[PDB]
Amino acid sequence: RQAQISNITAAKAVADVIRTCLGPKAMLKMLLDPMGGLVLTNDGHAILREIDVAHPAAKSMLELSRTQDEEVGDGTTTVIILAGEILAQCAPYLIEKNIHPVIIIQALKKALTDALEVIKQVSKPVDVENDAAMKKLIQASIGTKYVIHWSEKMCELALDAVKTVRKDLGQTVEGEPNFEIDIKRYVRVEKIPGGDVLDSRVLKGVLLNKDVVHPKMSRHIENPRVVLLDCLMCEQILAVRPTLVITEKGVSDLAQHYLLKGGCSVLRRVKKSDNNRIARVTGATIVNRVEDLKESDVGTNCGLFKVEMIGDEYFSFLDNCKACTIMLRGGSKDILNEIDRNLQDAMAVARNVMLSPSLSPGGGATEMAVSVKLAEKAKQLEGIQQWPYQAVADAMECIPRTLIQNAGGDPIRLLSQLRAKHAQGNFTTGIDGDKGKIVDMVSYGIWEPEVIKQQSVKTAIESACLLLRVDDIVSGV
Amino acid sequence: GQIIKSIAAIRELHQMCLTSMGPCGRNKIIVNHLGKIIITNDAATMLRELDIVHPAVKVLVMATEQQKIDMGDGTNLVMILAGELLNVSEKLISMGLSAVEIIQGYNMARKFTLKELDEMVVGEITDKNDKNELLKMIKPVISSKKYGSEDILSELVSEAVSHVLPVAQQAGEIPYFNVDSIRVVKIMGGSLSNSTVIKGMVFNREPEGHVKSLSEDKKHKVAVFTCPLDIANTETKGTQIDAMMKEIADMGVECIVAGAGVGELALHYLNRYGILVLKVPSKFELRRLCRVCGATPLPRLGAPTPEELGLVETVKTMEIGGDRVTVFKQEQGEISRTSTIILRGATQNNLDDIERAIDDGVAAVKGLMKPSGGKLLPGAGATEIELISRITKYGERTPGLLQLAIKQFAVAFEVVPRTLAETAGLDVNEVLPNLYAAHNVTEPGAVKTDHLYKGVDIDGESDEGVKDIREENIYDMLATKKFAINVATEAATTVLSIDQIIMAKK
Amino acid sequence: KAESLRRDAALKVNVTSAEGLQSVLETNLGPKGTLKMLVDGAGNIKLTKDGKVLLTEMQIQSPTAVLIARAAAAQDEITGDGTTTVVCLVGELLRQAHRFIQEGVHPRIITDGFEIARKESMKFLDEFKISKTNLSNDREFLLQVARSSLLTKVDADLTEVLTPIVTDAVLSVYDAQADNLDLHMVEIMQMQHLSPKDTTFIKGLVLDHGGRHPDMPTRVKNAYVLILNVSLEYEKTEGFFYSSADQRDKLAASERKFVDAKLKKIIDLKNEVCGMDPDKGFVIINQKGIDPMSLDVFAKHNILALRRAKRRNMERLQLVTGGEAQNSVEDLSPQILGFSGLVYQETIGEEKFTYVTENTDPKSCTILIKGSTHYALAQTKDAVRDGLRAVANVLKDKNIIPGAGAFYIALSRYLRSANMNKLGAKGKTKTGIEAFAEALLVIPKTLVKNSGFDPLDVLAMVEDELDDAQDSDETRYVGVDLNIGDSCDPTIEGIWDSYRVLRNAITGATGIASNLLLCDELLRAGR
């Protein structure tokens, strides 16, 4: 059992580091590098980034945070704190009660199922087709970002982003994917240098920063025929009824005038990889040499062609009618990158609500509600599992505890008041950050995407089994 | 944290008693600093021999002295309840609940527990002083001392008890049964079936006289003298021996006891004529002879005033286990106020330890006296498990941080049904959850029927769950429980209140 | 592989560190200040009262102090002064907090009051400022500003020296028609062999390499300057065979005659532009070299000739007189030359330096730091680099703040009396209202302590006069008199402060203290 104890002591330390990193009033942590560096960041990811750990159990706490961050853009410290206390509250049950780990693991699985029931009960519905409410929802949900003054479009930019990527299928034949979204890949955002944040806009298709060769050119073709070529030849182009000539390499005056004479535009410096992206949204054939051009060079599925210059660079619009490109505008590439730091975070907020159209009672009301509902289930559950089942209830009280502790209130009395408010009162009673008072989430909204709480509990119990199932730490190469 | 250091200290004596209590308990080897091997289950004997180090232990030890002196049982109930009441307080301390708030909680629970104990009453000993009513209590008292030997010890005690409880009727204001009413002696050799009970006094010293028996008459009169017997010395200085018995016998005396030395001729003549001679080194035992034979010691010499003679039915010299003893006893009359337990047993530790157990059984009967001592509670943690459920109900009824303390208060009463299991060898991961369900039922009624009788199985009858206490007639003394709760609650309150240990000026 | 304090003693560690930075960087405050010695281990001593030097060039042993120092370094890069007041405000904000921390006030409650005070402090700053007119007759106020910044960094005897220098320097750079000023157009030069009181203001630009030839004219009253990039030294076209001493120079002089034809063309300019005409002169400054015989001919026509010019100063020299850099003497025209007044080359036995003054229209000036030792030249260099930015803050921001700590003194009174009567915070957060106002006294208190005057009594005398203003229904700017020992009026005495400096001082001090007070655990990484 001594080896399992050492695994428990690992997570307790990981939690003690992250414990006070939760909240708008969160206490700062001091990262001391051996070279004399000192960072006071409140980013629990950065805290976990530098924490040099000994027990591989702590390494699994880091892999746990990676798993949460990769899937759900939030949940970092919620999972670290939740998962750690789930293990910690089981400690006297392992050591003193002499409960075999298999019994403990089986009990946690049953608590997971029951916990998901409570999470559903406390949920609040929200209509994702009410764009006006989704704007008020996402704008409040992204709370505390750098683009508060630009949050109007920094919110709407993400709403119009997820508007289209929604993986929409619903039927009893194959099932409902539930609007699965891939912000990393399916969405290709094209950040445009120049403009301001509020000038940012959303397009449909692929947008390239490859500029135009001649200032006089056919500006818009509603139904073009696009020739994707890399390299007599200028005449060969026109044989296939083209309207747009795109060249991979640089372009001289001869290609400007000969193709313009026939009403064809000239585009340079477009790599075959951008020519493939053109094929994704239109369908023209990629060709190297002009003497190899064939009748398959077509400009299908091309809704709009636009050649406007923004930011000392002409852009080629490949617009068509799980893919989208946003025409984000920013005074500099660093402003464009600042947009990502705040905008893509909103994309995750919208991904969560688009994943499930349901909200969670915040201020810690979700967790204290679970701690009450599990208690009623525990006394009604027969077996040795009466002991470990209560461990989750005591662990679910840590999250609301840290909200009180970082608020400066009495960490003992305020929790007991929360217990009575959830016992006889409504499940919507939470913790106010600024006042430090017990408040109802009807008054102070803070409604959180439910899937954050669902995945947080799932990944916490999952990792708890990974930490309990280890019987010894053995050396081997 | 002084309270944390105190918790560490109590963990030592908690480990001592946690494995001690119960008929399946484990013995402790105790080495006396004067060179005596003491092997016993009695934690009071343990703590008497255990040197006390941490001052917080002094609280717990003196608490057990309050229990043992004032009540002839409850020794481990104090140590066991106290150990866990302070163990569970570690959770309350670590949750941030202050010492005064924990103290306030246990005091609030003191009221809740005492009121519930009055409702846990199952039966009541109607004070018939009948062997059957005595056995209902003597058996469970002898239990926890020697498991399975109750048959030998119950017949020994319940019959010995009938010797010191005389025929009494309409008597609730007349006290009976002094602790010294039953004497226990040790004869090396034999086994349990070789033990017996004498209806009177037995002198562990071998026969000192040459006379074996008195006459055959009933109520042989007897004399005790205080002054040394010799040729009559005048009232002052002096710088007849046998004539004493010529004076004594006038009233009907066959037996002559001398509380002092013996003169020349009487040493021969007192025994020559068939009269028993006695000199007792124990002077309190001379006061016992005042109670057994009824003999009033004569303060003067050679002048047995009629009022200074008693009436004793039969005095003979008897052979016990091959080692001779002298018996001054009563026989169906002038009923003896003392009865002697004859323990024959070859192992001096088991022989002495059997006495230690019977000593406690004698003490239990002292608590079977009239002071509201007939109340019975359901044994084998049926009291403890039912208290757990009723305490948690008071938690639901109690607002405030006191709810946290009450919750941990109930957890503490699990140490008793747990100890009954850990010593008995049934899986605590199975017995304890079965106890919970056995006592926690939805009764179609306000009176739990057959669900307050659920017990803890210490027997080898393999069964999933637990047994019914009425099978063996296992009942606990209410007064023992009620007094123990008061002692442990206040004792733990004391330890929970120690904020700093300061050395006095030296 | 982890170390941290589960007890809050990490606050005791952070406070201990701040007390050190206080005791180190406090004693430098005020014209009654003391001087710190930085020893670099190579034998060089930097004698400084400047905070930026003591912040950026100190060996910091405390890991907590690393933050306070590096954070304070951001003060100078925003406002250009005020680094000492940051350090002192931070330490006292942390020390007054330790008092409230031991009372059980959670760091959040203390921090929130620090932020609430920041919002209130912006109100006072805007109400307390004095709007300055843009009259160029502000010489009196501009002189007074220079004294405020100089009396801090120098010994008060170099103040009378540096006061007219910095004042007249910035009067030159400040553009009229509400155009801005450019401190990069004000040159700062290092010269040895003179005393510190000899630091001088030059209307124009001084060159390092002077004339090296006995016939170089000493000065030109009315000078026309040529910037010449043509190689006038030994060059050859991109066979030389002599058999005796007679034939050597005939060949080389013929190859240098390609230069001498330009030497002829240069004196053809001299004859074209006042060869013999009076009250006119010709100054040559060549990027390339000048042949020793080319200097002789330049003497023949009384030409002040310079050679081997530094490129960056030569680019300035086009801006100095407004002339053009000449890439070929064959293109040498009479109008290319730039006009200046007194041009003279002062002889320093190490190197003669060229003074090019009274220039056409440079809008640029040079302050020549004079002084013999390295520790003296450094102290003066800081005084000039600091004072030029102090007078810039006044000309850029027309708002001036009554100095001598009137900001830090009166802000105490307003935050003590009003905030709770405003109901502007909360009952429990009043610990921050008091903490901030009590810490605002670290500046007027330290100013007094360093003077030797009674810390408590001087603060009392200040409050007495401030009370008179309440009944007098008038604005009385009351400050600390660091000379007599009593109170004074900054507007009568002439002690001024910057709006932008005090704005960023309170803003930054709140941020530094807030970050430190919220610290929970000190973690070790990479170990």
Numbering used by the authors:
A (entry chain g): 18 to 248, 282 to 371, 435 to 590
B (entry chain Q): 26 to 264, 283 to 549
C (entry chain z): 9 to 246, 250 to 538
Reproduce text from the manuscript describing this model.
TRiC is an ATP-dependent macromolecular machine that facilitates substrate binding and folding through ATP-driven conformational transitions. An individual TRiC subunit comprises three domains: an equatorial domain (E domain) that contains the ATP-binding site and forms intra- and inter-ring contacts, an apical domain (A domain) that comprises the interaction sites with target proteins, and an intermediate domain (I domain) that connects the other two domains.
We then compared the structures between the S3 and the better-resolved S5 states to capture the conformation transition in the final stage of ring opening. These collective movements of CCT2 and CCT4 greatly weaken the contacts with CCT1, particularly in the upper two domains, making it much more active. As a result, CCT1 exhibits a tremendous outward tilting of up to 44 Å, making TRiC appear wide open. This leads to the resumption of E-domain interactions on the CCT2 side, ultimately closing the gap between the two rings on this side in the final fully open S5 state.
